[PDB]
Symmetry: C5
Subunit: 311 residues, 5 copies
């Protein structure tokens, strides 16, 4: 089978449409997500045109083998899509209406800079290669683009599934290519982030600040160093949530700042002890007393500065 011939020098328009049935397995670390969906294609092949009153029937059904079908592919997929043709229907004028149901593991990069308040735009790229006999351009049939209401993605709120209607037509290896961008916008849903990660982590930190109300070097060392170990053990515990990145994250900065707060606390505890042993407890008391307000204030300000920087 060969592609349909043109009336004049015009290319062939293929009316695409992706309707999401199921979305699942969003791997934050692999930057992949799986999707089960319909793919509807529609073009006009006049060789397939028929008179309805002579044939008796209003639409003819065909097998994929029987007719010319455009080679549509996905750009950002791991392997070839697991597709099964649902129906092929030709109208009297030759307009083919193809429909298939596929499942694919899609690659879309993620932006963890604002985690756990981050919103993502997942992409699904459709592409078609233009043949020698005639050029092929992709079109969006907005009536055939959507998603089922049950469609969920655990820990996320699925906002919208839309398509960039203007295709990116370009040249590649001496032939024309028509690319389409399907966008799945998702915002993070993590209500339990505060009681499960932030709040227990902050308690550990405030426990260490009780050293500003003690004069026992031995107790203070235990307080500041043990809570530092407890902070690490707490991090080995909630590490699954800790977004695995190579740029600085909002959550990533806070964690770093917390390590600095533990270090500075040790300095104070060491200073207070040294001045006390050097028989100058007047300064040792001044510092400890200052630190009682200095540590919470500097922490609150530094978090305001950060929150501002990231949002």
């Amino acid at each position: 089978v060969s592609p349909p011939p043109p009336i004049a020098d015009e290319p062939l328009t293929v009316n695409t449409g992706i309707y999401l049935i199921e979305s699942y397995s969003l791997d934050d670390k692999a930057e992949t997500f799986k999707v089960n969906a319909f793919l509807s294609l529609s073009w006009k092949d006049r060789r397939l045109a028929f008179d309805p009153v002579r044939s008796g029937v209003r639409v003819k059904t065909y097998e994929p083998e029987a007719i010319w079908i455009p080679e549509i592919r996905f750009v950002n997929v791991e392997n070839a899509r697991d597709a099964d043709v649902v129906d092929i229907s030709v109208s009297p004028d030759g307009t083919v209406q193809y429909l298939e149901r596929f499942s694919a593991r899609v690659l879309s990069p993620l932006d963890f800079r604002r985690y756990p308040f981050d919103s993502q735009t997942l992409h699904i790229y459709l592409i078609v290669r233009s043949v020698d006999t005639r050029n092929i351009v992709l079109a969006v049939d907005l009536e055939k683009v959507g998603k089922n209401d049950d469609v969920f993605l655990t820990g996320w709120d699925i906002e919208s599934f839309t398509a960039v209607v203007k295709p990116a037509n370009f040249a590649l290896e001496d032939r024309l290519e028509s690319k389409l961008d399907y966008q799945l916008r998702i915002s993070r849903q993590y209500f339990s982030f505060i009681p499960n990660i932030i709040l227990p982590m902050l308690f550990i930190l405030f426990i260490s600040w009780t050293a500003f109300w003690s004069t026992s070097y031995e107790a203070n060392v235990t307080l500041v160093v043990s809570t530092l170990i407890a902070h690490i053990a707490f991090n080995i515990l909630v590490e699954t949530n800790l977004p695995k990145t190579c740029y600085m994250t909002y959550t990533g900065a806070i964690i770093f700042m917390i390590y600095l707060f533990y270090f500075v606390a040790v300095i104070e505890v060491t200073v207070q002890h040294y001045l006390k042993v050097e028989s100058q407890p007047a300064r040792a008391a001044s510092i400890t007393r200052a630190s009682r307000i200095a540590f919470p204030v500097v922490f609150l300000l530094a978090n305001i500065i950060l929150a501002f920087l990231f949002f």
Copy 2:
């Protein structure tokens, strides 16, 4: 092959039935489970009808290729089902009796709010797309819906496998679709949750309350902070047996409240020490003595309040 033509205007009824052979691999985190089962379908195609007298035989066996079979699909499956046709049998009147054996990884959302006492309703959705020549509706043959007695799901009690007899008929991408709901009800079975997770966690907490019978700040700091580390280490240990959710869990609330109890204990220990060093051991003793009854009482009440809230 084309679908059977109607005598009048009536749609084609397909009598469905799923009989579970083997259930397994329930992934609480992925919200998936795997199932091995039979799928029985039945429809009336009068084109295949035959007189038993002249043919000699009462039932004719066919190959899938030889006859028209409806395109039945699962909605909430990860990839296409691994199906193998068992038998196709046409009765004299043309009533086809299809049977296949399939295996599929099903997506059914889970509700961890009441874990480890949670009960789930696993769904299996059957769907058929109506063709242009004829509309197709799904029906349930209750005599062909069930499960083998050996059918197990480790850590769960399989209660019932039933089907919502009324199909959800709706319009999708300009064509009619008949959807069916098969429900697998399972209640959690975790007897060892108390001795393996709750009881050792509570012992750690009670160890921390021995600080209300000590006046040694150095011993108390060790007691309350070490058991806090031990609580985390215990959590990194039973981290597998922890339900991973983005809403608040019963178990998850307890865990949070336990972190608050550790924090408050530190405050008491710090207060008792400060009042003692500030030469006011009369109130330091009062507080420590109150805490001896205050900490267990508030803990018991708060757990009653929580258990009431979730159940």
Copy 3:
């Protein structure tokens, strides 16, 4: 092709045989094990009978497509077996000698109540569905059931591979089914559980009992709480080695009892300190002295009681 017709009303006997070539990947947590084996089937189809004198040859070889072969399936398999036909050989009387080499991931529940001294019985169920024309029953050819001598399963001792010769014939979805039980008996060979899990766990516990020879509350708190953390860290270390169950295990019970021993030790340490501070060191010394023999004795007895209860 259709099944062979009966001389009388008798059903068709298919002589089964599974010979294990390789056993591997026993997943204690998934309750699965993979196997690579031969499957030999033998029946009598008189339509295939031939005179050896006129034909010249004593046995005729056929292609699966060329002749009727019964639809044999496995019950407890994850997906369809990866089978490849080795040889099909028809004797003069019409007796077919089928042989195929397959590999399958089998599901067989495990009993961890007596771990690490547990022995398991892995099952492989063969099933055949009776057709309309004639009923099919499965038989065991003991000469064709066995296992290679190299057959190993790391973590176990392979005792026997036998078959329950009497098939479980029953009715399902209005048709007869003949089921067969193949049993692979394996006993656990973990001979180093003691030096790797039990002995170090016990050392850590005995270290805590040195608190009965000390009067230093501060040292005792460190001793009993640190070894409690060390017990957890040891458990996060050997947790891969330990069993994953939703009932009570022998190992599980001991672990639980050990947590109780840590709690009781804390009570003693707390009591001894309180009586000493309340200026009553006569009873504080009595208790500590009693505990020196009470803790080991109660431990030995309780382990005898438990070992008896489980075995």
Copy 4:
């Protein structure tokens, strides 16, 4: 189908070209990476020549089955590539222009000696085995070798995708083989390595050096041993971000040196205490005072020496 016959004794030249569409799943531990690309091949088969006047069309399209296509394979791939033919086009002269799209998990060794500043040269080897009738040699069409601009590999910066134009022609199992080297040059991108791994690790080490300003053996033991535990806990935490190698890494040298610094600190702490108890606090103070500058200086120098040795 047989290969095209030579005019004279010249071999057949196949013009290769790999254009990367997607690069992903770089497994540092497995030394593998996955890739999704186009493979364009071009050779001359004069048996396929045609007159565009008689044939009507300027280029004929063929099915893989219909014509002779060279058996091109990848050397360093895990399994066979998941290829799908895009287009086969023959010009009147007999020049075949093949194009397929393949996915493949490629094996290229990695050099972690300079991690996290390491750069890699990933290889993709194309090979063709010469047949008996005529020899086959591989050629590079530089116009058909490249990569899409969106092509990413998380935590790395993709520098270049080039091909060694001269094929490595050699003899293997008595026949000629033409091998081609495609090189993907990447350099590590880990900005957050300093705040997430190095800086918190160093804080923990500096905390241990506060023992040079204390005389309390009990506090010093806690300081040096607790930070040693904290160093390990931190390493179990960042364990993921550590290259798992069987030679010495730049990072692996630093980590080792840090363990030596902890050991030496213990010696000092032990020595200072012994001299103090042996009533010689003049030397004990000298050592502690020296260590205040000795430990940071030796650490800075040793890191300079190392950084120089590795880079």
Copy 5:
């Protein structure tokens, strides 16, 4: 197609040869390794013989379907090999020369008794089942057995790839079977085992022995118990690099002996304290002083005894 008939009673000799292209994914815990190789087979089929003079050509190429090919299989493979026929050539006398490229995940038991100094012998078993008409025996063509020079196995040194030339002929299920043993000898390469596992582990143990230079029970308890926790944390860290076995290992024995050394140290610390409190510091000092030389000496000898016992 049927097998070639014999001139006499002689069996058919098939000349085997495996040439390794790629070796990878050696899973120490699963006892498996993946391999990508050529498989060359050669047998004499006189039915395929041809006079060069009449035929015109010296060698005829065939399709697998066109001629009789022996059913060669691998014994110790997980699933069926992913094979693709490269070339089939028939010389004028009838000598078929088959060549295919395959990939297989092989099963080869490993011996971790001498880890990390262990050397392994990986096996690849070729087998052929004798047919009724003619018996089949396997032969080794040493000119066709080898490995590419780039062939690597990370963390191992590939010594040799040879084949046991004498096949193991035996009877299985009433038919003759010819088995061949291909051996891949690999010796471990773990230079960094000393700085990454042994040396930091010994430093922890050495730290514990500083308790023999202290009289502070409180400091000694911290020293011995904390380093015991640090030993565990270190083990949870390097547990990836420790042989995941059953039977006693060289590394396995050392680790155990180290746990005994921690326990004995506690006894000394406890004894020294008890004698001191019981006002007998003459004996308490003697023991501590003896232990200063007793602990290192007994450790050095016990390791000498061990290494002798294992090597």
